Amino acid sequence: MIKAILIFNNHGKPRLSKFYQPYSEDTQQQIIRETFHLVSKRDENVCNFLEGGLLIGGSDNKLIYRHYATLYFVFCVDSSESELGILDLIQVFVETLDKCFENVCELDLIFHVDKVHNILAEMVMGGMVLETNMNEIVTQIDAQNKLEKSE
Amino acid sequence: MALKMVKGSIDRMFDKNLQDLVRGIRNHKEDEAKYISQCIDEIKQELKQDNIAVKANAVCKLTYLQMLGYDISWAAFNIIEVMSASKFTFKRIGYLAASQSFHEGTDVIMLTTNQIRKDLSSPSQYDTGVALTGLSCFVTPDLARDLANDIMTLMSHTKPYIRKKAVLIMYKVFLKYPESLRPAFPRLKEKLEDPDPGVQSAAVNVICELARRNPKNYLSLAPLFFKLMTSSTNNWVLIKIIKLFGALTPLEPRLGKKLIEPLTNLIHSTSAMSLLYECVNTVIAVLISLSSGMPNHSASIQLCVQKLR
Amino acid sequence: MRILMVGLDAAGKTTILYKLKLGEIVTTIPTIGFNVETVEYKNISFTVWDVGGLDKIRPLWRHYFQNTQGLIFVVDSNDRERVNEAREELMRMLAEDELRDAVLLVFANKQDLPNAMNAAEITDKLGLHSLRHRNWYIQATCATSGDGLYEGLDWLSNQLRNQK
Numbered sequence A: 001m002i003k004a005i006l007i008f009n010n011h012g013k014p015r016l017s018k019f020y021q022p023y024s025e026d027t028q029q030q031i032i033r034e035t036f037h038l039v040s041k042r043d044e045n046v047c048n049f050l051e052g053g054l055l056i057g058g059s060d061n062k063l064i065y066r067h068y069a070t071l072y073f074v075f076c077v078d079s080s081e082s083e084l085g086i087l088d089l090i091q092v093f094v095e096t097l098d099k100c101f102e103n104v105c106e107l108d109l110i111f112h113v114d115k116v117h118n119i120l121a122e123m124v125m126g127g128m129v130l131e132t133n134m135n136e137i138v139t140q141i142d143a144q145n146k147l148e149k150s151e
Numbered sequence B: 001m002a003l004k005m006v007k008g009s010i011d012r013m014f015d016k017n018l019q020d021l022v023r024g025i026r027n028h029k030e031d032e033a034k035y036i037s038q039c040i041d042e043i044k045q046e047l048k049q050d051n052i053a054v055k056a057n058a059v060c061k062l063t064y065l066q067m068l069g070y071d072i073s074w075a076a077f078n079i080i081e082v083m084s085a086s087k088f089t090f091k092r093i094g095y096l097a098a099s100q101s102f103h104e105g106t107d108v109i110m111l112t113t114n115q116i117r118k119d120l121s122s123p124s125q126y127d128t129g130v131a132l133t134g135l136s137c138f139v140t141p142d143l144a145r146d147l148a149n150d151i152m153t154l155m156s157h158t159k160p161y162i163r164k165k166a167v168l169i170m171y172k173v174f175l176k177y178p179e180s181l182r183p184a185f186p187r188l189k190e191k192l193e194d195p196d197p198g199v200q201s202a203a204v205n206v207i208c209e210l211a212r213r214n215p216k217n218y219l220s221l222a223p224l225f226f227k228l229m230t231s232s233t234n235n236w237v238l239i240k241i242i243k244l245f246g247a248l249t250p251l252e253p254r255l256g257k258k259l260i261e262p263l264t265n266l267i268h269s270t271s272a273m274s275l276l277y278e279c280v281n282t283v284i285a286v287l288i289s290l291s292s293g294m295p296n297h298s299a300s301i302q303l304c305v306q307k308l309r
Numbered sequence C: 001m002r003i004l005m006v007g008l009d010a011a012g013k014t015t016i017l018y019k020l021k022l023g024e025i026v027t028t029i030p031t032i033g034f035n036v037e038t039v040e041y042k043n044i045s046f047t048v049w050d051v052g053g054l055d056k057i058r059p060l061w062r063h064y065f066q067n068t069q070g071l072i073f074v075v076d077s078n079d080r081e082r083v084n085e086a087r088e089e090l091m092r093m094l095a096e097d098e099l100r101d102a103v104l105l106v107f108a109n110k111q112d113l114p115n116a117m118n119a120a121e122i123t124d125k126l127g128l129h130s131l132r133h134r135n136w137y138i139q140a141t142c143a144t145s146g147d148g149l150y151e152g153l154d155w156l157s158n159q160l161r162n163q164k
């Protein structure tokens, strides 16, 4: 379903990139720059529901994006999906980020991207949304943190 | 002797971490290529070492550079070693590296399988789930075939977390082996009846995708999906089932003919605008499919256009 | 003490390793990948790496030559028809320059079968006497009963260590 998740600044520098459909490295960065062009130039009043890219394998897919300040949050997903539902999942994922990082910021994406990736994994794997109960996922994240601290 | 270990520890203190690497590239943006080349040589030498923690932080920087888009597959065996560490604090790093770095055309596809079945067989749910995640982002055909024997029982795990993650990885396993699908399809249906809603939803999405790829496997399961929505209360699961049906109604008009009334009731009871639009679009498709010979779709379209207004 | 321990398939590598760990004979499946465990014997910790013995996994034995301080070859005396394949594998492995300064301990396993061949003829077939610049040893070993394990461990620790 979800093909890739890309997080990047206003200058195209990455902040979180996760892929699920197979793609070589160079294809990955080409998709990244493509998405940066397709999204970053959009105005803040442009609909968040954009068509998918071509390097990903077909425009049938969709590029669901939400941006703030200088940060852009795009989830590369295929055609048969719930753009509105994807957006709700993005919102709850950001809320989970807030719950787990205590007001997450860009600095956390820079230095703590490992735990952000962990949160995303507990959210979604291989294009599959694992959890939509935000309390439940933060409970898992705290449980893994407790296991790490204990031993 | 001991002073040599002290010197090694001091060098480790002067060694960089992932955060040190990101700070350095931020301070050396002009010399970014040069700095990352020096750092990659340092990582190669620190992987030549035997400290599992130093090599784990090296793998941290390597995964980061993979995000920056550089070739780290040369240390794939090193990542194997990192994910094979006795401490899971480094197994997380190794699996995170392998999830975005490994490739099915390499030798890691056969060299690693023992760690996977060990971590799956490991009673501690966290490592087992982490290995399942790593495979979900890096599973190869031979891997999926040889691992399904264990993962199917993993779907029967005590803790529901392993069950949901196992069903979700099983989906990709099916994507590489319908030979697993033929026997596991009834087991997938059984997992659809897990008392925990989460494992239920995992099986739900897996079977929805399976039907999307093969519409030959839903015909007898249509009442199952009907009861599945009706028991379902989660928004995303409801949307997934409704979208499956939007994919199924053109193939079986009678299915949508039965679905329209409970869907209409749902539209009455729907409070999420996101679910509202999806229900509206799906029932518009259903009404278009059924409009030949049922002269009351006008009222349903009327309700739909009130919702659209 | 990083140790790379090799052999053929169904030889007894993993059985020997697990018996070294916990003192029990475990049910073994073919080692498609590899296993890693750390062995503490005679106050010395050994990191023995059990690679798979299958022919298909044999080409991938190149990767674990790095930093290896010792080599162990589990020898199936009951598998008399594969003693050749064993000796070419050992000859090719010793041909590598990476294992010039490692040590070699030989485990003549499967001695419970009546057809088991003595460690002297194992030396003759493998040509251990022809080894040059190579401190080596051979002993009859039995995985299921354990016999032959600890004295080989003492030998390996004897060459690896430099003091008590």
Ligand SMILES: Nc1nc2c(ncn2[C@@H]2O[C@H](COP(=O)(O)OP(=O)(O)OP(=O)(O)O)[C@@H](O)[C@H]2O)c(=O)[nH]1
Binding pocket: C007, C008, C009, C010, C011, C012, C013, C014, C015, C016, C028, C029, C030, C031, C032, C051, C052, C053, C054, C074, C109, C110, C111, C112, C113, C141, C142, C143, C144, C145
């Ligand atoms: N009779 C007898 N059988 C043994 C002995 N040691 C191991 N075995 C048996 O030999 C078979 C293969 O043993 P493994 O330890 O799996 O062999 P391996 O070298 O690890 O094989 P690969 O994983 O393919 O590399 C098993 O059925 C063991 O129980 C022994 O000393 N005597």
Ligand SMILES: [Mg+2]
Binding pocket: C013, C014, C015, C028, C029, C030, C031, C051, C052, C053
């Ligand atoms: Mg084995």
